[PDB]
Write a structure and sequence with these properties.
Layout: H1 3-18, H2 21-42, E1 45-48, E2 55-57, H3 63-72, H4 98-105, H5 116-125, H6 190-197, H7 202-207, H8 209-213, H9 221-232, H10 279-288, H11 300-303, E3 307-309, H12 314-321, H13 325-338, H14 340-347, H15 349-352, H16 355-362, H17 408-422, E4 430-432, H18 437-446, E5 454-456, E6 471-476, H19 513-528, E7 536-541, E8 547-550, H20 560-584, H21 587-594, H22 598-627, H23 637-656, H24 663-676, H25 679-685, H26 703-718, H27 733-736, H28 741-765, E9 782-783, E10 789-790, E11 799-800, H29 809-814, E12 845-846, H30 858-867, H31 874-887, H32 902-911, E13 922-924, H33 932-943, E14 952-954, H34 958-964, E15 969-970, H35 982-986, E16 990-993, H36 997-1007, E17 1012-1015, E18 1022-1025, H37 1037-1044, H38 1061-1068, H39 1073-1089, H40 1096-1099, H41 1101-1114, E19 1136-1141, H42 1147-1157, H43 1193-1196, E20 1236-1237, E21 1243-1245, H44 1253-1267, E22 1282-1284, H45 1298-1307, H46 1315-1322, H47 1324-1331, E23 1336-1341, H48 1349-1364, E24 1375-1380, H49 1387-1412, H50 1414-1428, H51 1432-1438, H52 1442-1468, H53 1482-1500, H54 1503-1506, H55 1512-1534, H56 1542-1553, ...
Parallel strand pairs: 3-4, 3-5, 6-24, 7-23, 11-15, 12-13, 13-14, 19-21, 19-22, 25-27, 25-28, 26-27
Antiparallel strand pairs: 1-8, 2-7, 9-10, 16-18, 17-18, 20-21, 22-23, 28-29, 30-31, 30-32
Helix pairs in contact: 1-22, 2-20, 2-22, 12-19, 13-46, 13-47, 19-48, 20-23, 20-24, 22-23, 23-26, 23-28, 25-26, 26-28, 30-31, 32-33, 39-52, 41-49, 41-52, 42-48, 49-55, 49-57, 50-53, 50-55, 52-53, 53-57, 53-58, 55-57, 57-58
The structure holds a molecule of 3 linked components (NAG-NAG-BMA), a molecule of 2 linked components (NAG-NAG) and 2-acetamido-2-deoxy-beta-D-glucopyranose (3 copies).
One 2-acetamido-2-deoxy-beta-D-glucopyranose binds next to loops.
PDB class: transport protein
Keywords: ABC transporter, membrane protein, transport protein
Assembly: monomeric
Length: 1938
C-alpha cells in the first residue's frame, strides 16, 4: 500500500510544524534523567575488603581476658588476615602485645631455663637470724695467729694498737707480718639478665614507657589510648579497619533529613552522691565536656549501675550469689590496690631509717666480690658504684635517677591515683526488689542519671521458692535505647555488609546485655550443678567476605520506573491528544471515505509516534552511558528494553484513544490514566513482593508493571555486575527465578500486541459513526430506479430537499458511503458492483464540515489531498499550480490552514474537495456560513470548474440555487419534481415593490385590474402582478405610470422583482433578587442531577481517595510497642548451624559435645514442651554425608593443599568492576561438611578437624545467593554454631601459694603489716583462680541476625549446664531461657514515636486535601463551560448585576460541597480513624472540612478568567492545589524538627506567610489535631492526662479564623476582578452618502471600545417598527458595535461611547439599560442540560413577578412540543438556534439584537422564524439583524445599513439602497435577441452564451420599453418565456466591499 508514505509524511509535517511538543519531548526526559545522574554522583558506592573480627570475651571467661578484650575491641576492628582466635587451638589474640612479648622473653630465659635453680638456693638462704640481729654479733674471739676473728694474745692490745711485731694487725690475722661463700659464681644470672634487657623488650621501657614516665599524662588522650593499646592489645596492621555500618534505614529520622540529631536527656551536673567527692569532680568533667559526653554516657551504667531482681526468693538470692563472680573479684582487686596505703609507709621505711639499707653502704671493701659490683663490669650498662644511683643516694640528700626518688614517689602517686579512680565504682550493684512493679518505677527514676544497668525479673517463681526448677526461666529488662528492638529480628532491607559498627548496632555488647546475661546464666548453671569445671565464653563474630555496598542500589529500583513513567507521561498525553483530535474534527471519517483503510491510519500513527520515541530513547541511552549510571549492564539491551517499553506505551495510547471524543479531555485524562496504571507495580513492590506466585503475568497485565519487574531484575543483577549481558539475559536467571528478564520483556511485547488488538476491536464498534459488535468473520451519472434523476455533465444540479425527506439518504446512497444496490445509478458509466475502485478516484466530495487539517499549510493541503488518490509527484506539482491559479490564493501560499481566513477556509476546502480529476462531484452546503464576497469568490471558483465536471451542490439557501447554476432538482420526499432551469421552473407571479397609501394604491388599480398589495408593511408596499398572459399593461406599464407620476408622490424608489425561489421550494413541500437567585439555583440543581459524570464523579472520587488513604494509614502497625522475644535460634527459619569438636582429650568436652549434639538436641528444646511452645520437634536424625561433586569439587580440592588456604580462594574482583560479593567459584570453602543432621529443625554440620574460617567466609556467598529471592527479608540459612574446645594459652603458672612466697619476701621486714593487706591476701587463691579460665569454648554469631549473639550464648550456656551435671538427672529436662522485655518508654523516648505517627498523619492529611480539592476544580470547570461558551453575559443582560450571580453561585457551591464534606466525615466516623471521631475532636474536624471549601472556592473562582479550555483547568488546578498543599505541609512539618536560625523563619512562615492558603490551614488543623490526640494518648497511660480542648484560638482556631476571613476577602477579590460621554447628535446624514419622538429610538453617536478605530461615529437609531439591519464586511465585523450596544463584554467606553437603550445612555447605567435588549447569542449559548425547563429558567428577569404565567409564557415559542422534552444537548443544528431566538423574545422587548437569527436550518423552519419576526415587528418591537445571509436581510430588514472599514456607508430601506447601487431573463438562436438587445435597447450586457436561457441586464431605468418587445413580441424575437428581476441585494453588498 502506498498511502502509508503520504500519511507518514503528513504526520511528520504536523510534528515539525508543532515545534513545541517535539522539542520538549526530545529534551525534557534528558533533564529528568539528569536528576538520576546527579543522584549517582552525590551518592557513592562503599567498597571494603574481607573482615576477620577478633574474639569478644565474656565475664565467665575471667576478669583479665574480659577486661582486656573490652578495652581492645572498642572499635571491633576489621582484619583482613584471620585472627588467632579463629584457629582451633589458640583462642587468645593478645600474644603480639608488648606485655605479651615481654612475658614471653621472661619465663623462657629465666624461669623455664635450668640456670635459676642454683640461684634459688641463694634466694631461699635468707640467713635472717632474729636473735643474731639488732647489734647482737659479739664473739669471744679467743683464736691466736689465725682468723676466719682477732687475736687477743698480747700484753699491750689485741688488734688496733698492737699492729707491730705482735698479734693480728689486719683482716687476716698474722703474728709475723701484716697481710655459700660465692653466690652464683659471684654473678648469679648475670648473662641471662643482660640478654633479657637487651631483647626488643627494651621497646617496652626505653621506647614506649618514657612518654608515660615524664609528667602525669604525656599528651592528648588519643596518644595515651594508643600507647595502652600497644602495651595490651598489640594488634597487627596498626589500627584495625572499620565498616561504619552506613545504614540509617532503621528509624533515626533526625539524623537523615532533620539535620543534627539531638541525643537523649543529658544529665545536668554532679548533684552530690556517696562517692569520694573526687569522683564527683571527674564525673562532672566527663558528663559536661562534649568530648566525653558520649563515651561516659555509654560507660556510666556499667561502672556505676544497679541490677535488680524481682523474685527476692532464696533461689534468686542463691543464683545472684553465684552471679557476682566478677564483682566479688573486682572487690579483691580494689582491696589489693588499697593495700598500698598500708604497705607504703613500711616500704619507704627502708630508705629513711633501716638497718638493711646500711648493709649495702657498709659492703664496699671486700664483701660481694671485688670493689666492682657487676662481676667486674660484666656488661656495658652494668657495673658502676650504684651507691649514688636508684639503688640508694642516702636517706635524704640533694641526680638523673638518684635514690628512690623519681621511681618510688611516682609509683606511689600513680598507685594512689589508680586507687582513687577505682574507688569511683559501684560493686553492690544487685538490688533486691519484689512484685516487678517497684522495679519499673525505680528504673525510670534511675534512668534520669543513667545509673541503671538492667533488671533481671524471673517469671514463674514466688518469693518463697527456695528450690530451683529443672527449667529455670528469666528475663532481662534493658532500656530500649541501648538494646536491640524486639519487634524486628532482621534489618528488613538486606544491605551487603557485616553489620559491625562499634556503637551503632552492637547494642548487646557495649550496652551490657550480653555481660549481664552471661553472668546470670553462669550463676544459674553453678547453682544447679555446683561441680566447678569452669568454661567461659569467647564470642567470635562470623567472618565476612569482601563486599561492595552501593547506596544507590536502593534507588533505580524504586525510582527508575517513577522517572520513566513521568518522562513518557507527556509524550503519551500529546500523542493521545493528536489521535483524538484527528477524529474530533470528523476527519477520520473523511479519510475512511476517501479510500484509505483504518489499518493504514493506525500503522502511520504508530510510525509517527515511534520515530520520535526512538530518537528520544537513543538520546536517553547516550545520556545514561555518559552519566555513568548503568556502567556494567549493557549498551544495547537497555536500548532494546526501552524500545519495548515505548512500543508498549504506544499500544496503550492507541487503546486509550477510545472512550474519548474531545481532544482536550483525552489529553488531560491520559496523563493520569497512564500513571494510575503504574500504581499497582508500586503496590506490589511495597510489602507485597513476599507474597508471589512465581508467575506475575496476571498482575503484570499493565506495561508499567512489566517494566518495573524488568528493572527490578536489572537492579538485582547489577549488584553482582554484568546486569543484562546476552549470556544471562534469560533462561531462568537471577538465582533460578522462574520469571525472567527476557520473559518479562517478551510478555510486555505480547501485552502491547493484545492492547493494539483490543484497541482495534473497540474502535471497530465503539464510535457512533459505525459499528458491528461481534463480527464473527467466516450523460454522466444517472439514476433510473434506485428516483429518476439524470445529472448532466456540465450542470450544477442543485439537489434541493427538505431535511429528512430524501435530501440526505439519496445523497448517501449515491456517494457510495451506504450503497443500497439493486439500482441503476451508473455513476460515470460505472455501477455499484465495484464502487471501491475507479469511482473514488474521480468522485471528489465535500461534507458540511471542513476537511482541512489544523496545522498543515495550504502549500501542502492540496498536495496531500491530490496524492492520496494520485500516483506521482511530478504531476502533483502541476495540479497544485493549476489549483492555485484557479483559486487566486497564490499570495497566501505559506500561511497555515489555522491562520487562514474564516471565509478562505471553506473556499480552500471546496477547492480541494475535487482535485484528482473528479468527473462527478458532490457538495454538501458549499457556502453554509461565509461572507457574501467570499460566497461570490467561491461561486466564481465553482463556475470555473464546470468545463468537464458535473458539480452537485445541496444548498439550503433557495436564493443561492437560482444564482449558482441551472437545472435545479427538488425531491419532495420521493422521485423528482422538475429537473429544469430556474427560469423554466419559476412558472411551475411578478411582484413589484414600490417604496400616501391611497395615492400609491390608486396607481396600481387604475393601470391594472390584477394588482394587489400583498403586505402593507411599514415603509414598504409589495404589489402582486400575474405572470401568465399579463399583456403589456400589467408587465411594465405600471413602471411607466409610476415613472410618469413620481414627482408628487414621495416614494423615491421603484423596482420590479420576480418570484423568489424560497416560495417555490416551500410550495412543493430589591424584591427581584430573591426570584433570580432561586432561578439560578434551580438551573444548577437540574444541571447537577442531569449529569452522572459531574455529580457522582465529584462526590465519589474524593470519597475513594479518602478511603484509600484510610486503608493505607490503618495497615501501619504502631511503632511504640516492644514485645518480648523468647530469644532462641529458631526464631528465624530453617538454618545451618555448624559444630566443631576440638580438644578431644578432655572427657568433659567429649560429654559436652555428646549432650550438645545428640542426647537433648542442639538448643534448648527440652523433653517437655519448652523453649518452643509453637515449634514442634520432629524425629529425623539422619546423620547423612554429602554426595561427591566430581565436576571440579571432588578434584580441585583433591590435590595437596597446605595449612594455609586449604580452599582454592575465590575471586574478590573488586578491582575494575564492583561485583559486591565475590561470587566464589565451585571450589568455595573446599569439601562440604562431613555430615548434615537435624533433630528439632536445623541442619547441623560437623566442622571438626576442618578449617572454620576458610569455610565460613567462602560458602556464605553461595548460601545468601541461594536464599536472596526478594532482598527484603532474606534468611541466610546460617547464624553460627559454637566451637567446643580451646585452651586459653596464658595461665598463671604460680597459681596458689603465691602469697606464701610474698610473705617470705615481707618476712624479714615490716613489708608485712596493715589490716587492709591481710583482708586482701586472705582470699588471694580464689582471685587467681578466677583471673583466667583454662578450658574454654568459642561461640560464633552472625550479627546480621539481630538476636543472634544472645541466642547462641543461651544455647552454649544450656549445653554447659547439661554437661556439668553428674550421671543422673537426665539433661533432656534441664535448660535456661532468657526473654528480652525492654522497659516502657518515657516522654523523650515516645517523642520519636509521636513524630513517626505524625508523619503518617501528615501524609493522610495531604491525601485528604488533594481529594477535597477536586470539587472546586469541578466548580471552575462548570464556570468556564458557562463562560467561554457564552450564556454568561446572556444571564448578565437578562438578569441582575454580577454580584448576586456570584453570590448564588457561592451558595450552590456550598450546597454541593456540604454533601462531599458529609461523605468524608461519614467515612472518617467508621473504624475511629486516629480517634478523629471523639466527641471533643469531631467538631473540630467537621468545622475544618466545612470551612476549607468556604475558604478555597473564592480562590477557585478567578481561575475561570485565566482558563478558556474547560478541561485543562481541572488538571492545572488539581495539580497546583496538590503542589501547594504538599509544599505547605512539608515546610511546616519537616522544619519543625535544632535551633539553627531556621526556627525563626519557620515561625514567620507559619504565622504570616503561609497562613493565607486554606490548604495550609487545613493541613495545620489536621496535623495539630493528630499531635494533640497522640499527646493525650501518651498521657493517658502515664496518668498525667490533659484537656487540650480544640479551637485553641492560637493553634487550630487560628486556621478556622484564617479560612473565615480568607473566604470573604477572596470573594471580594473575585468581585473586583469581575468589576467618556463628550457629545452626541440626532442628525442622520449617512443616507446621503431632529430629535427622539419615536418608540425604541436612539439619537447618539458611537466610538470603538478598543485602542483602534473599530466602530466610530455611527447612525442615530431605529424607528419603532423598523428591522434595522447592521450589516457589514468581515473587515468591520460589527462585533465592536454589537457588543457595545448589548451584551457588555467589549463594551468599553473608548473615546465617545454614548449609545443608549432608548431610555438612557450606556454610561454608568449599562446594567439598567440591559433589561431592554436581549442578545440573540450568535454563539449558540444553550450551555445547559435542561429539557423543557431551560426556557423556564431563561424566562426570569420578569419586571415584577411571573410564576403563575411562566408555564404558559414558555408555550409561546417556535412550534413548541416538538423538541422541548428532548435534552438541551440533543438538539439539532437549527434547533438550538430556534430555542435561542425564542428566548431572545420572551418579554416583548422594544429592541431585540437578533445576531444571526437562523443558521443551518431548513427553509421550512426559516420561513416560520421569519413569520415570527414579522409578527413581532408588526406591533412595534424593533429588531436588529446582522446575519451574513442576504436572504434573511432582504426578507426581514425594513431598513438596512452596511459598515465598511469601520464606518457605515449607506442607509435607508433595502429597495432605495439597492436602487442607487433589472436583469431580464429570456428563454428561447441568439441572432435576433442580440440584435434586439443592441438595436431596440441602446444599453445591455453579455448574453451568457447561447444556452437558450439568457440573462440580460440593462443599465438604465427604461423599463417601459422592455414590455412590448418581451411579452407581446415574444414570437417576434423567438422567445418561449421571459422574466425580469431586479438586482439582488447580495450584488449591492458585494459591490461595496469588492
Ligand atoms: C556479690 O559480691 C559482692 C562482693 O563485695 C557484694 O558486694 C557488697 O559490697 C558492699 C560494699 O563493698 C558490702 O557492704 C558492706 O557491708 C558491711 C556490713 O556487712 C559494712 O560494714 C561495710 O561498710 C559495707 O557497707 C556488702 O556487704 C557486699 N554484699 C555482701 C552480700 O556481702 C554483693 O552484694 C554480692 N551480691 C549478691 C547478690 O550477693
Ligand atoms: C508500659 O507498657 C506495659 C506493656 O506491657 C504496661 O503493662 C501493661 O499495660 C497494659 C496496657 O496496654 C495494661 O492493660 C496492663 O494492666 C499493664 N500490666 C500491668 C501488670 O498492669 C505498663 O503498665 C506500661 N507502663 C506505663 C505506661 O507506665
Ligand atoms: C601467638 O601464638 C604463638 C604463641 O607463642 C606464637 O606463634 C606467637 O606469639 C603468636 N602467633 C601469631 C600471632 O601468629
Ligand atoms: C619525688 O618527687 C618530688 C617532686 O620533685 C620530690 O620532692 C621528692 O624528693 C621525690 N622523692 C620522694 C618523695 O621520695
Ligand atoms: C618496723 O616498724 C616498727 C614500728 O614502726 C619499728 O619499731 C621497727 O624497728 C621496724 N623494723 C625494723 C627492722 O626497724
Amino acid at each position: 500500500v502506498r498511502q502509508i508514505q503520504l500519511l507518514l509524511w503528513k504526520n511528520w509535517t504536523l510534528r515539525k510544524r508543532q515545534k513545541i511538543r517535539f522539542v520538549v519531548e526530545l529534551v525534557w526526559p534528558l533533564s529528568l534523567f539528569l536528576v538520576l545522574i546527579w543522584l549517582r554522583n552525590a551518592n557513592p558506592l562503599y567498597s571494603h575488603h574481607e573482615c576477620h573480627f577478633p574474639n569478644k570475651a565474656m565475664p565467665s571467661a575471667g576478669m583479665l581476658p574480659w577486661l582486656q578484650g573490652i578495652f581492645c575491641n572498642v572499635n571491633n576492628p576489621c582484619f583482613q588476615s584471620p585472627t588467632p582466635g579463629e584457629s582451633p587451638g589458640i583462642v587468645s589474640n593478645y600474644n603480639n602485645s608488648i606485655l605479651a612479648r615481654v612475658y614471653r622473653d621472661f619465663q623462657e630465659l629465666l624461669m623455664n631455663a635450668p640456670e635459676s635453680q642454683h640461684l634459688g638456693r641463694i634466694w631461699t638462704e635468707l640467713h635472717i637470724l632474729s636473735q643474731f640481729m639488732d647489734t647482737l654479733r659479739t664473739h669471744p674471739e679467743r683464736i691466736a695467729g689465725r682468723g676466719i676473728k682477732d687475736e687477743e694474745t698480747l700484753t699491750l692490745f689485741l688488734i688496733k694498737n698492737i699492729g707491730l711485731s705482735d698479734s693480728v694487725v689486719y683482716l687476716l690475722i698474722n703474728s709475723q707480718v701484716r697481710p655459700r661463700s660465692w653466690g652464683g659464681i659471684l654473678s648469679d644470672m648475670s648473662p641471662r639478665i643482660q640478654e633479657f634487657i637487651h631483647r626488643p623488650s627494651m621497646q617496652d621501657l626505653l621506647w614506649v614507657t618514657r612518654p608515660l614516665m615524664q609528667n602525669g599524662g604525656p599528651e592528648t588522650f588519643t596518644k595515651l589510648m594508643g600507647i595502652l593499646s600497644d602495651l595490651l592489645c598489640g594488634y597487627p596492621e596498626g589500627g584495625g579497619s572499620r565498616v561504619l555500618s552506613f545504614n540509617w534505614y532503621e528509624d533515626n529520622n533526625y539524623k537523615a533529613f532533620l539535620g543534627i540529631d539531638s541525643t537523649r536527656k543529658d544529665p545536668i551536673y554532679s548533684y552530690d552522691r556517696r562517692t569520694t567527692s573526687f569522683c564527683n569532680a571527674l564525673i562532672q568533667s566527663l558528663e559536661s565536656n562534649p568530648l566525653t559526653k558520649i563515651a561516659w554516657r555509654a560507660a556510666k551504667p556499667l561502672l556505676m549501675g544497679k541490677i535488680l531482681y524481682t523474685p527476692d526468693s532464696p533461689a534468686a538470692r542463691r543464683i545472684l550469689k553465684n552471679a557476682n563472680s566478677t564483682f566479688e573479684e573486682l572487690e579483691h582487686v580494689r582491696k589489693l590496690v588499697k593495700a598500698w596505703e598500708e604497705v607504703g609507709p613500711q616500704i619507704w621505711y627502708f630508705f629513711d631509717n633501716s638497718t638493711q639499707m646500711n648493709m649495702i653502704r657498709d659492703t664496699l671493701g671486700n664483701p660481694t666480690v671485688k670493689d666492682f659490683l657487676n662481676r667486674q663490669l660484666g656488661e656495658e650498662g652494668i657495673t658502676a658504684e650504684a651507691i649514688l644511683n636508684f639503688l640508694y643516694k642516702g636517706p635524704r640528700e640533694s641526680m638523673a635517677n638518684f635514690d628512690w626518688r623519681d621511681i618510688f614517689n611516682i609509683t606511689d602517686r600513680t598507685l594512689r591515683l589508680v586507687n582513687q579512680y577505682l574507688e569511683c565504682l559501684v560493686l553492690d550493684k544487685f538490688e533486691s526488689y519484689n512484685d516487678e512493679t517497684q522495679l519499673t518505677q525505680r528504673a525510670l527514676s534511675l534512668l534520669e542519671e543513667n545509673m541503671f544497668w538492667a533488671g533481671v525479673v524471673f517469671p514463674d517463681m514466688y518469693p518463697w521458692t527456695s528450690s530451683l526448677p529443672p527449667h529455670v526461666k528469666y528475663k532481662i529488662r534493658m532500656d530500649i535505647d541501648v538494646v536491640e528492638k524486639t519487634n524486628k529480628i532482621k534489618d528488613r532491607y538486606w544491605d551487603s555488609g557485616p553489620r559491625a559498627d562499634p556503637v551503632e548496632d552492637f547494642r548487646y555488647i557495649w550496652g551490657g546485655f550480653a555481660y549481664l546475661q552471661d553472668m546470670v546464666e553462669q550463676g544459674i548453671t553453678r547453682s544447679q550443678v555446683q561441680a566447678e569445671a569452669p568454661v567461659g565464653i569467647y564470642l567470635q563474630q562470623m567472618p565476612y567476605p569482601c563486599f561492595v555496598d552501593d547506596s544507590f542500589m536502593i534507588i533505580l529500583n524504586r525510582c527508575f520506573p517513577i522517572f520513566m513513567v513521568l518522562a513518557w507521561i507527556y509524550s503519551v498525553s500529546m500523542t493521545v491528544k493528536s489521535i483524538v483530535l484527528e477524529k474530533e474534527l470528523r476527519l477520520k471519517e473523511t479519510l475512511k471515505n476517501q479510500g484509505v483503510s483504518n489499518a493504514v491510519i493506525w500503522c502511520t500513527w504508530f510510525l509517527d509516534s515511534f520515530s520520535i520515541m526512538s530518537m528520544s530513547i537513543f538520546l536517553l541511552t547516550i545520556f545514561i552511558m555518559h552519566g555513568r549510571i548503568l556502567h556494567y549492564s549493557d549498551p544495547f539491551i537497555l536500548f532494546l528494553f526501552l524500545l519495548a517499553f515505548s512500543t508498549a506505551t504506544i499500544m496503550l495510547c492507541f487503546l486509550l484513544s477510545t472512550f474519548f471524543s474531545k481532544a482536550s479531555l483525552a489529553a488531560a485524562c491520559s496523563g493520569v490514566i497512564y500513571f494510575t496504571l503504574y500504581l499497582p507495580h508500586i503496590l506490589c513492590f511495597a510489602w507485597q513482593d513476599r507474597m508471589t506466585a512465581e508467575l506475575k503475568k496476571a498482575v503484570s497485565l499493565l506495561s508499567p508493571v512489566a517494566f518495573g519487574f524488568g528493572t527490578e531484575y536489572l537492579v538485582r543483577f547489577e549488584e553482582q555486575g554484568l546486569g543484562l549481558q546476552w549470556s544471562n539475559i534469560g533462561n531462568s536467571p537471577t538465582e533460578g527465578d522462574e520469571f525472567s528478564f527476557l520473559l518479562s520483556m517478551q510478555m510486555m511485547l505480547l501485552d502491547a500486541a493484545v492492547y493494539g488488538l483490543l484497541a482495534w476491536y473497540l474502535d471497530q464498534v465503539f464510535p457512533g459513526d459505525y459499528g458491528t459488535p461481534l463480527p464473527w468473520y467466516f450523460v454522466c451519472v444517472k439514476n433510473l430506479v434506485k428516483l429518476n434523476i439524470t445529472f448532466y455533465e456540465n450542470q450544477i444540479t442543485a439537489f434541493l430537499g427538505h431535511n429528512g425527506a430524501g435530501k440526505t439518504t439519496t445523497l448517501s446512497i449515491l456517494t457510495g458511503l451506504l450503497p443500497p444496490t439493486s439500482g441503476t445509478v451508473l455513476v460515470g458509466g460505472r455501477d455499484i458492483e465495484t464502487s471501491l475502485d475507479a469511482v473514488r478516484q474521480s468522485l471528489g466530495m465535500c461534507p458540511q464540515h471542513n476537511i482541512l487539517f489544523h496545522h498543515l499549510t495550504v502549500a501542502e493541503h492540496m498536495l496531500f489531498y491530490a496524492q492520496l488518490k494520485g500516483k506521482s509527484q511530478e504531476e502533483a506539482q502541476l495540479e497544485m499550480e493549476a489549483m492555485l491559479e484557479d483559486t487566486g490564493l497564490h499570495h497566501k501560499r505559506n500561511e497555515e490552514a489555522q491562520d487562514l481566513s474564516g471565509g478562505m477556509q471553506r473556499k480552500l476546502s471546496v477547492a480541494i474537495a475535487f482535485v484528482g480529476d473528479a468527473k462527478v462531484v458532490i457538495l454538501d452546503e458549499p457556502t453554509s456560513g461565509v461572507d457574501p464576497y467570499s460566497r461570490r469568490s467561491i461561486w466564481d471558483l465553482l463556475l470555473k470548474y464546470r468545463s468537464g465536471r458535473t458539480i452537485i451542490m445541496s444548498t439550503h439557501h433557495m436564493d443561492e440555487a437560482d444564482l449558482l447554476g441551472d437545472r435545479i432538482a427538488i425531491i419532495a420526499q420521493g422521485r423528482l419534481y422538475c429537473s429544469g432551469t430556474p427560469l423554466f421552473l419559476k412558472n411551475c407571479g411578478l411582484y413589484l415593490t414600490l417604496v400616501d397609501v391611497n395615492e400609491l394604491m390608486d396607481v396600481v388599480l387604475h393601470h391594472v385590474p390584477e394588482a394587489k398589495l400583498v403586505e402593507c408593511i411599514g415603509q414598504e408596499l409589495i404589489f402582486l402582478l400575474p405572470n401568465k398572459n399579463f399583456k403589456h399593461r400589467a408587465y411594465a406599464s405600471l413602471f411607466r405610470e409610476l415613472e410618469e407620476t413620481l414627482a408628487d408622490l414621495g416614494l423615491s424608489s421603484f423596482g420590479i422583482s420576480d418570484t423568489p425561489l424560497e416560495e417555490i421550494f416551500l410550495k412543493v413541500t430589591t424584591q427581584l433578587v430573591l426570584q433570580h437567585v432561586q432561578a439560578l439555583l434551580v438551573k444548577r440543581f437540574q444541571h447537577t442531577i442531569r449529569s452522572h459524570k459531574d455529580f457522582l464523579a465529584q462526590i465519589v472520587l474524593p470519597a475513594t481517595f479518602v478511603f484509600l488513604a484510610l486503608m493505607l494509614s490503618i495497615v501501619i502497625p504502631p511503632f511504640g510497642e516492644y514485645p518480648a522475644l523468647t530469644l532462641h535460634p529458631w526464631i528465624y527459619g530453617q538454618q545451618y548451624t555448624f559444630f566443631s569438636m576440638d580438644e578431644p582429650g578432655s572427657e568433659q568436652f567429649t560429654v559436652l559435645a555428646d549432650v550438645l549434639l545428640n542426647k537433648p538436641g542442639f538448643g534448648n528444646r527440652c523433653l517437655k514442651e519448652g523453649w518452643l511452645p509453637e515449634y514442634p520437634c520432629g524425629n529425623s536424625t539422619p546423620w547423612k554425608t554429602p554426595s561427591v561433586s566430581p565436576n571440579i569439587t571432588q578434584l580441585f580440592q583433591k590435590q595437596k593443599w597446605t595449612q594455609v588456604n586449604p580452599s582454592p580462594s575465590c575471586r574478590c574482583s573488586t578491582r575494575e568492576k564492583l561485583t559486591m560479593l565475590p561470587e566464589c567459584p565451585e571450589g568455595a570453602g573446599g569439601l562440604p561438611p562431613p555430615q548434615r543432621t537435624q533433630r528439632s529443625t536445623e541442619i547441623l554440620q560437623d566442622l571438626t578437624d576442618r578449617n572454620i574460617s576458610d569455610f565460613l567466609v567462602k560458602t556464605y556467598p553461595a548460601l545468601i545467593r541461594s536464599s536472596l529471592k526478594s532482598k527484603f527479608w532474606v534468611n541466610e540459612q546460617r547464624y553460627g554454631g559454637i566451637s567446643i574446645g580451646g585452651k586459653l594459652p596464658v595461665v598463671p603458672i604460680t597459681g596458689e601459694a603465691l602469697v606464701g612466697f610474698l610473705s617470705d619476701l615481707g618476712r624479714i621486714m615490716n613489708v608485712s603489716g596493715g589490716p587492709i593487706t591481710r583482708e586482701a591476701s586472705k582470699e588471694i587463691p580464689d582471685f587467681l583462680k578466677h583471673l583466667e579460665t583454662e578450658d574454654n569454648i568459642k561461640v560464633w554469631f552472625n550479627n546480621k541476625g539481630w538476636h543472634a549473639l544472645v541466642s547462641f550464648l543461651n544455647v552454649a550456656h544450656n549445653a554447659i549446664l547439661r554437661a556439668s551435671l553428674p550421671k543422673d538427672r537426665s539433661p533432656e529436662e534441664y535448660g535456661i531461657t532468657v526473654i528480652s522485655q525492654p522497659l516502657n518508654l518515657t516522654k523523650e523516648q515516645l517523642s520519636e514515636i509521636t513524630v513517626l505517627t505524625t508523619s503518617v498523619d501528615a501524609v493522610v492529611a495531604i491525601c485528604v486535601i488533594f481529594s477535597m480539592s477536586f470539587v472546586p476544580a469541578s466548580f471552575v470547570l462548570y464556570l468556564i463551560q458557562e463562560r467561554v461558551n457564552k450564556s454568561k453575559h446572556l444571564q448578565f443582560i437578562s438578569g441582575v448585576s454580577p454580584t448576586t450571580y456570584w453570590v448564588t453561585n457561592f451558595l450552590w457551591d456550598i450546597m454541593n460541597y456540604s454533601v462531599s464534606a458529609g461523605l468524608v466525615v461519614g467515612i472518617f466516623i467508621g473504624f475511629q480513624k486516629k480517634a478523629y471521631t471523639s466527641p471533643e475532636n469531631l467538631p473540630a474536624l467537621v468545622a475544618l472540612l466545612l470551612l476549607y471549601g468556604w475558604a478555597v472556592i473564592p480562590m477557585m473562582y478567578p481561575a475561570s478568567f485565566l482558563f478558556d479550555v474547560p478541561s485543562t483547568a481541572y488538571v492545572a488546578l488539581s495539580c497546583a492545589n496538590l503542589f501547594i498543599g504538599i509544599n505547605s505541609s512539608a515546610i511546616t512539618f519537616i522544619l519543625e524538627l535544632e535551633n539553627n536560625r531556621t526556627l525563626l523563619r519557620f515561625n514567620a512562615v507559619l504565622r504570616k506567610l503561609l497562613i493565607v492558603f486554606p490548604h495550609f490551614c487545613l493541613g495545620r488543623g489536621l496535623i495539630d489535631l493528630a499531635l494533640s490526640q497522640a499527646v493525650t494518648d501518651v498521657y493517658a497511660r502515664f496518668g498525667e492526662e490533659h484537656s487540650a480542648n480544640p479551637f485553641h484560638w492560637d493553634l487550630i482556631g487560628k486556621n478556622l479564623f484564617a479560612m473565615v476571613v480568607e473566604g470573604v476577602v477572596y470573594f471580594l477579590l473575585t468581585l473586583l476582578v469581575q468589576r467618556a460621554e463628550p457629545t452626541k447628535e440626532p442628525i442622520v446624514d449617512e443616507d446621503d452618502d431632529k430629535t427622539d419622538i419615536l418608540r425604541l429610538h436612539e439619537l447618539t453617536k458611537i466610538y470603538p471600545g478598543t485602542s483602534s478605530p473599530a466602530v466610530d461615529r455611527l447612525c442615530v437609531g431605529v424607528r419603532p417598527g423598523e428591522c434595522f439591519g447592521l450589516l457589514g464586511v468581515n473587515g468591520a465585523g460589527k462585533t465592536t458595535t454589537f457588543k457595545m450596544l448589548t451584551g457588555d463584554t467589549t463594551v468599553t467606553s473608548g473615546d465617545a461611547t454614548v449609545a443608549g437603550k432608548s431610555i438612557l445612555t450606556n454610561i454608568s447605567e449599562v446594567h439598567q439599560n440591559m433589561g431592554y435588549c436581549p442578545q440573540f447569542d450568535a454563539i449558540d449559548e444553550l450551555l445547559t442540560g435542561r429539557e423543557h425547563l431551560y426556557l423556564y429558567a431563561r424566562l426570569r428577569g420578569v419586571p415584577a413577578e411571573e410564576i403563575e404565567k411562566v408555564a404558559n409564557w414558555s408555550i409561546k415559542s417556535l412550534g413548541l412540543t416538538v423538541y422541548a422534552d428532548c435534552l438541551a444537548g440533543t438538539y439539532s443544528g437549527g434547533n438550538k438556534r430556534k430555542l435561542s431566538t425564542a428566548i431572545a423574545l420572551i418579554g416583548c422587548p422594544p429592541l431585540v439584537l437578533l445576531d444571526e437569527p437562523t443558521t443551518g436550518m431548513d427553509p421550512q423552519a426559516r420561513r416560520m422564524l421569519w413569520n415570527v419576526i414579522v409578527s413581532i415587528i408588526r406591533e412595534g418591537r424593533a429588531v436588529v439583524l446582522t446575519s451574513h445571509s442576504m436572504e434573511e436581510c432582504e426578507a426581514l430588514c425594513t431598513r438596512l445599513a452596511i459598515m465598511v472599514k469601520g464606518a457605515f456607508r449607506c442607509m435607508g430601506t433595502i429597495q432605495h439602497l439597492k436602487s442607487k447601487f433589472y436583469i431580464v431573463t429570456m428563454k428561447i438562436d441568439l441572432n435576433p435577441v442580440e440584435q434586439f438587445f443592441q438595436g431596440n435597447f441602446p444599453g445591455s450586457v453579455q448574453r451568457e452564451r447561447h444556452y437558450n436561457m439568457l440573462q440580460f441586464q440593462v443599465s438604465s431605468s427604461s423599463l417601459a420599453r422592455i414590455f412590448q418587445l418581451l411579452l407581446s413580441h415574444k414570437d417576434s424575437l423567438l422567445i418561449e418565456e421571459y422574466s425580469v428581476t431586479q438586482t439582488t441585494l447580495d450584488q449591492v453588498f458585494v459591490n461595496f466591499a469588492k
